[PDB]
Amino acid sequence: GRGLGPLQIWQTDFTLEPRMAPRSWLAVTVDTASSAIVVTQHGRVTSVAAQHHWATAIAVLGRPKAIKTDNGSCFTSKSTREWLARWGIAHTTGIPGQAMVERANRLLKDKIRVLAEGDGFMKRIPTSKQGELLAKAMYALNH
Amino acid sequence: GRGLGPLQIWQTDFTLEPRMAPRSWLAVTVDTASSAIVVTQHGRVTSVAAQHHWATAIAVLGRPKAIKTDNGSCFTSKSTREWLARWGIAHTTGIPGQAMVERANRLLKDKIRVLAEGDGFMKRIPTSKQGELLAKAMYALNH
């Protein structure tokens, strides 16, 4: 039960991280209630990538009441609008307001760099090592 | 803080689900403290698949104190033993004891079937639809 606790509102963004190429587009959600982050990697910034990301974020965090994004085409497309309506999730792009996800993006890229360099990867992370490294970064920031 | 709450012990298993082919091996963790489930799909049952799965489960659930599995080769290999030691996670295969993960396996396969059939997929789920369907099943059982 929420009671008087924080409203179930996420912020979501994409951030480009070449250390994670070829799937260098990181989709990042921050739960504004808890500050928990979910991150997934994607080859291309698309509407369907956003939807795949949120499907995973819902599995992890539960179904939010609302999601805040910017006005990027992957978020304002008919496809994305319909996907969010299917889920019953309200969507805002703010006042024509997401400092928390901007912070998450920076903390995540910094952590990825630190972990990668720790493993001796000074440039791109080998593809076979990326999934666990990304999960380690998410763990590091959440737990 | 745990206080007097349940110990941070997981149960993990693999279960084969042809509706999810070609990545029909589902790695399933249940957190015995909360009954939360994490599921990932894999093409082959291997030590590294187990490790990839747990990396994701740690991102979602936090680092457990211990994990219970059976004596399958993917769990008792030198590779897996070393990976768990790297993380500082105790590993048991029990008394030469994981009813909760067996229940999770059944609830998950039943839910996958229901969701798939709801979408009109009476046999294998099209590959492009599997990730979101699996995430939906995980959501359904956790939230």
Swiss-Prot record, chains A, B:
Residues 2-143 form the Integrase catalytic domain. Transmembrane segments: none annotated. Its cofactor is Mg(2+); Mn(2+). Mg(2+) 3 binds at residues 13, 70, 102. Binds 8 Mg(2+) ions per integrase homotetramer. Zn(2+) can also be a cofactor for the nicking activity, but not for the polynucleotidyltransferase activity. Catalyzes viral DNA integration into the host chromosome, by performing a series of DNA cutting and joining reactions. This recombination event is an essential step in the viral replication cycle. Has a strong preference for using the 3'-OH at the viral DNA end as a nucleophile. The core domain contains the D-x(n)-D-x(35)-E motif, named for the phylogenetically conserved glutamic acid and aspartic acid residues and the invariant 35 amino acid spacing between the second and third acidic residues. Each acidic residue of the D,D(35)E motif is independently essential for the 3'-processing and strand transfer activities of purified integrase protein. Homodimer; further associates as a homooctamer. This is Integrase. The chain holds residues 1332 to 1478 of 1603 of the full protein.
